[PDB]
């Protein structure tokens, strides 16, 4: 059983976060001081440390320093309030793997923990900027609460989940949430983006191929995903010929590797996503109607940023830390007039536009605080 050490001196928060992790079937140990965390580690090296920056006997940075003096590999995820993004960024620079903005929600914590444990000891590869909060999957606006509700109900079912929403609204992270809350959480999570692959290769990427299939026997997504979750992202980009083979695979669980006539089978739970209107794609003859009704079982609609109220403040704070790290700067807060302006703007490009705007600010300015004079058009 994997071990997570939670260094958290607020007992109610530690209990809440431990309850969030219940679906993952882990051994979670709570300590409330740096002394007790370091004592634990002398005996048992955990598979992950969740480390609050604020502790009664020493700072979280001091814990991190003392851990890294003897343990260079154990993953550390920092838990921080808005007010300590400056310290969270310095913690990453010193040797921590990611930071989580508090308060945290159940799905975001499960995704972060599951990704940190699988990265160490096989799912689709992941890095820091792939973290849930940077993709917009953070906050407790009513529209997001509706998403979390469906994830919780659906995760335990094998029924296919069909995710819609504009580009950059959190659809891929929503699929990771389903996986982490499901009984398949410890099995592979495989995401294939159907737009990211050329058409002459996507059948091979999905179903594998044998040696000399086209100008050695490689394993496709369906095989990598066996007993786990297969996510088909940007699914409406798939061509009609491949759609017919996908429908056959969904119905029968059977497939052929490219270049082979041999029949193979796997057991996957399906999630898919599109930023198109899927029924419109059916009406226009671009998407098979039978495939639509086969897949459109448990629908989830991600709300755009303009419908999510105060969530934008949380995402912006996460991204300010991420862009400071990426661009070698030390921004850690926004002025209140900047935040008011971010709340009034409708973000037509959703999280990608938010990332762009914050990156532009961080590249062009050197400050600890984002001020109104830094905000580009068309925001102001």
Author numbering: 3 to 123, 127 to 220, 224 to 388
What's written in the study?
Here, we use X-ray crystallography to study LuxO, the central quorum sensing regulator in Vibrio cholerae and related bacteria. LuxO belongs to the subfamily of AAA+ ATPases known as bacterial enhancer-binding proteins (bEBPs). In LuxO, as in NtrC proteins, the phosphorylation of an aspartate located within the R-domain activates the C domain for ATP hydrolysis and the opening/activation of σ54-dependent promoters. Here, we present crystal structures and in vitro and in vivo functional studies of LuxO that together reveal what is, to our knowledge, an entirely novel mechanism of AAA+ protein regulation, in which a regulatory segment of the protein prevents substrate ATP binding and hydrolysis by occupying a portion of the enzyme active site.
We determined the 1.6 Å resolution crystal structure of a V. angustum LuxO construct lacking the D domain but containing both R and C domains (denoted LuxO-RC). The structures of the individual R and C domain are very similar to those of homologs such as NtrC1 (root mean square [rms] deviations of 1.3 Å and 1.7 Å, respectively), although the relative positioning of the R and C domains is unique. Rather than forming closed rings, V. angustum LuxO monomers in the crystals form continuous helical arrays with six subunits per turn. In the V. angustum LuxO-RC structure, the R domain is nestled between the two lobes of the C domain, forming a discrete interface with each. Interface I is dominated by an interaction between α-helix 5 (α5) of the R domain and α7 of the C domain. In interface II, α4 and β-strand 5 (β5) of the R domain interact with α13 of the C domain. The R and C domains are connected by a 20-residue linker (denoted R-C linker, residues 123–142). Strikingly, residues 137–142 of the R-C linker occupy a substantial portion of the C domain active site, sterically occluding the binding of the ATP substrate. The R-C linker is stabilized in the active site by an extensive network of H-bonds, including four with residues within the R domain and three with residues within the C domain. Gly 141 of the R-C linker appears to be especially important, as it not only makes three key H-bonds using its main chain nitrogen and oxygen atoms but also occupies a position deep within the active site that could not accommodate a larger residue.
